[PDB]
Amino acid sequence: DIQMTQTTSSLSASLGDRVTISCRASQDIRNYLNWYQQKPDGTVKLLIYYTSRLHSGVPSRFSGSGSGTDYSLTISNLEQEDIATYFCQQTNTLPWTFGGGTKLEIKRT
Amino acid sequence: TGPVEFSTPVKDYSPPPVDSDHKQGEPSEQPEWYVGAPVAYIQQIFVKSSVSPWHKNLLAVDVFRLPLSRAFQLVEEIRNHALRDSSGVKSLEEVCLQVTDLLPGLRKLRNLLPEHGCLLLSPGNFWQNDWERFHADPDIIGTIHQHEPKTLQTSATLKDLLFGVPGKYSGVSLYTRKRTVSYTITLVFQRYDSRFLSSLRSRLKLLHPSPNCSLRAENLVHVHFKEEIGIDSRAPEVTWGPEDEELWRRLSFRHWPTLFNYYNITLAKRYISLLPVIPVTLRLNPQEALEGRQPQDGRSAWAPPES
Amino acid sequence: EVQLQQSGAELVRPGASVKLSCTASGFKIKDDYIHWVKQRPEQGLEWIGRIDPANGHTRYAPKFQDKATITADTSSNTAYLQLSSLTSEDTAVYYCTRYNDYDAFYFDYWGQGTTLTVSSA
Ligand SMILES: *[C@@H]1O[C@H](CO)[C@@H](O[C@@H]2O[C@H](CO)[C@@H](O)[C@H](O)[C@H]2NC(C)=O)[C@H](O)[C@H]1NC(C)=O
Ligand SMILES: *[C@@H]1O[C@H](CO)[C@@H](O)[C@H](O)[C@H]1NC(C)=O
């Protein structure tokens, strides 16, 4: 199989600040990466497919980039509604695999 | 007499039954020739390009070389395309039409039309799908127009068959108008697979996205052939509109019969189905052509008739 | 406009079987594959398998070959997931999803997920 790795499990952030989330593939997946958002209530939503194609209705804040085995998801400016968990999924070899997921927070103190 | 047509939606398509009904219903809207499965499903991949920062150092040869260089890679991608999560067919080999031999007496057309495999047509057939031969060819225009008749003929020319495009969209005249030669990769299918065709279209769209493209892609078109008895620069941007689909209507009326008679396949009693076109857009740059500049640059062994 | 309505929460004894459900609205399941994804609190998302309701061709991950059984019926526009020989490892949240593009294979719309609990209680 292909192992998708998200190095950071949690990622503190602040409103307005740009946030980048990156995950590494075990082998070349040929720009077949999907990014998903999971609200704390449990709803899951597609943000970006292929590598940078924005899904219909997704705000312009989200953007993706990467090639080969390294990819990243960026948010232009963080809103309160953007606090959720994000997963990357590869669709190159048929047994689709997901990453561990990164959870966003708010800066304190 | 002439090619009659009949169009059906792509949403839910299935070939009509051959002999389930002895007599068709009286108020039936279908034509009486729309009975059996088609001879072939013609899928056309319309490839348009644009050299965006056009400048004066481009020549007529580059107008052909720049888009046709991508043709070989595009053909290889189409041929090797496989549906990664298929439930039915996977590869082009399982569905496309197989041709064995050309007719005897077409020794001149051998090695210019495909044989012993899939019936896939493209401008690369001039150089036999060999990018090395294409790169080593001293006169691309000369090779393309080598087999052009000096007078109008009923049968479609080899260049017309390979490009799959009306003559006004090609030819060295586009250099003056600062446009770029647009060709078509012609896929001939023996069987229709909606899922494979959708995967191919989406793969091509992902590889070469086409901006400002809103093609309907809503209906198939079936064509029936009756019997014949005699007894400062501002480079034009790639535009996709209502005239880009149904471009096969502007081809010669003997195009498809000419193509299919070469392989001893007859269309006298039967019909063919023309799938909606798959748009492919290429973004080219003048630096590629400038770095690929070759000797024997502005001289070609082909002079179009200008009187 | 496109919705995937999933069933309620479940709680079964270990060693039993459950039949999850997924009702589709705004589209017909003949048009697209319906998938199932497994999520545990510490193991992330796992892809279970898919079905093609047009012809019923199902394929699974090698982990879930002897565990899952995905079935769908067009008449009620509903897809189902069956898990057999349940154990404490099988408690998770199972999501229902589809895709409409057949080269990127991105999961398009998701259900809210059904929490499954396995315990002797
Ligand atoms: C070209 O095709 C025609 C039919 O479209 C062939 O004619 C028949 O071919 C079959 C082949 O099994 C023979 O059994 C028949 O006796 C042929 N009938 C007639 C009237 O010719 C023809 O043989 C084909 N020619 C070539 C060179 O392939
Ligand atoms: C092409 O699409 C872009 C992006 O949506 C937008 O400017 C407009 O719809 C089109 N522009 C032109 C010049 O056709």
Give the integer Cα–Cα distance in Å for B202 and B194: 12
Q: Strand A102-104 and strand A53-54: pairing?
A: unpaired
Q: Which residues of C25-43 are buried (b: 16+ CB within 10 A; e: fewer)?
A: eebebeebbbbbbbbeeee
The span from the CA of A102 to the CA of A84, in Å, is 8
What backbone phi and psi angles, to 5 degrees, belong to B207? Answer: -70, -45
For A21-74, the DSSP string reads: EEEEESS--TT-EEEEEE-TTS-EEEEEETTTEEPTT--TTEEEEEETTEEEEE
Task: With CB atoms and an 8 Å threshold, state whether B84 touches A53.
Answer: no
Structural domain spans, chain A: 4-104
One-letter amino acid at C87 equals T
Which residue of chain B comes nearest to A91, CA vs CA? Answer: B84
Alpha helices in C11-112 (DSSP H): none
Q: Which domains does chain C have, with CATH numbers?
A: 3-109 (2.60.40.10)
Strand partners, B194: none
Contact between A25 and A36 under an 8 Å Cβ cutoff? The reply is: no
CA B115 – CA B99 distance, rounded (Å): 6
Tokens describing residue A22 = 């990156």
Asked if A29 and A38 touch (Cβ cutoff 8 Å), the reply is no
The answer to whether residues A75 and A14 touch, using CB atoms and an 8 Å cutoff, is no
Residue B179 CA: distances (Å) to CA of B100, B144, B233: 38, 19, 11
Look at ligand 1, atom 3, and give the residue with the nearest C-alpha: B264
A19-25: strand order across its sheet: A4-5, A19-25, A70-75, A62-67
Which residues face B44 on adjacent strands? B186
CB contact under 8 A, C57 and B88: yes
Instruction: Name which of C77, C76, C80 is nearest C114 in CA terms.
Output: C80
Distance CA B73, CA B64 (A): 16
Amino acid at A101: G
CA C81, chain centre distance (Å) = 5
Burial class (CB in 10 A: 0-12, 13-18, 19+), A94: middle
Given a contact cutoff of 8 angstroms between Cβ atoms, the answer to whether B178 and B167 are in contact is no
The CB density around residue C111, as the number of other CB atoms within 10 Å, is: 26
CA angle C104, A27, B208 (to 5 degrees): 35
| Residue A65 φ then ψ, to 5° | -160, 165
Asked whether the beta carbons of B284 and B180 are under 8 A apart, the reply is yes
How much distance in Å is there from the Cα of B210 to the middle of ligand 2? 11
Nearest CA to C105 out of C61, C59, C54, C50 is that of C50
DSSP B50-109: EETT--TT--HHHHHHHHHHHHHHHHHHHHH-B-TT-SS--BGGGTBPEE--PPTT-TTT
Selected residues 16-45 of chain C with any CB under 8 Å from a CB in chain B: 33
List the structure tokens of B291.
């770095």
Q: What interhelical angle do B60-80 and B194-207 show, nearest 10?
A: 140
> Pocket around ligand 1: residues whose beta carbon is below 6 Å from it?
B 264, 266
Amino acid identity of residue B102, one-letter, is L
| Pairwise CA distance, residues A64 & B249, whole Å | 41
Task: Name the 3-class secondary structure at B248.
Answer: helix
Beta carbons of C96 and C4 less than 8 angstroms apart: yes
3-state secondary structure of B261: helix
Residue C92 per-residue DSSP state = E
| Tokens representing residue C65 in the block | 């070959």
DSSP B195-251: HHHHHHHHHHHHHS--TT------EEEEEE----------PPPP---TTTTTGGGGS
- Report which of A64, A56, A58, A62 is spatially closest to residue A89, judged by C-alpha positions: A64
* B:C CB pairs within 8 Å: 25
Q: How far is A66 from chain B, CA to nearest CA, in Å? A: 15
> What does the block give as tokens for B62?
């580059």
CA of B234 to the centre of ligand 2 (A): 17
- Triad A13, A16, A17: Cα angle to 5°: 45
Question: Nearest CA to B206 among A60, A51, A96?
Answer: A51
Q: Are A11 and A104 in contact (CB under 8 A)?
A: yes
Alpha carbon of B209: minimum distance to chain C alpha carbons (Å):
14
CB of A36 closer than 8 Å to CB of C107: yes
**Can you tell me the distance from the alpha carbon of B285 to that of B137, in angstroms, rounded to the nearest whole number?**
21
Query: After which residue numbers is chain B interrupted with C–N beyond 2.5 angstroms?
Result: 231
Is the Cα dihedral B17, B21, B27, B32 positive or negative? Answer: positive
Q: What are phi and psi of C49, to 5 degrees?
A: 180, 175
What was the elucidation method?
cryo-EM
Nearby residues of C82 by Cβ (< 8 Å), 6 or more positions away: C17, C18, C19, C20, C68, C69, C70, C71
Please report which ligand is nearest the Cα atom of B211: 2
- DSSP three-state, residue B213: coil
A4-104: CATH, from 3.40.50.410, 3.40.50.300, 3.40.50.10860, 2.60.40.10: 2.60.40.10
Amino acid residing at B2: G
Question: In angstroms, rounded to a whole number, what is the distance separating the alpha carbons of residues B184 and B103?
Answer: 24
Q: Can you tell me the distance from the alpha carbon of A94 to that of A36, in angstroms, rounded to the nearest whole number?
A: 19
**Torsion sign across C-alpha atoms B185, B187, B192, B195:** negative
CA distance B156 to B252: 7
The residue among B53, B126, B58, B52 whose CA lies nearest residue B297 is: B58
What is the resolution in angstroms?
A: 2.8
**Residue identifier of the C-alpha nearest atom 6 of ligand 2:** B212
Nearest CA to ligand 1 atom 1: B264
**CA nearest B77: which of B248, B212, B205, B214?**
B205
Q: Which amino acid is at B34?
A: Y
Q: C45: helix, coil or strand?
A: strand
Q: Which two tokens stand for residue C15?
A: 């060693």
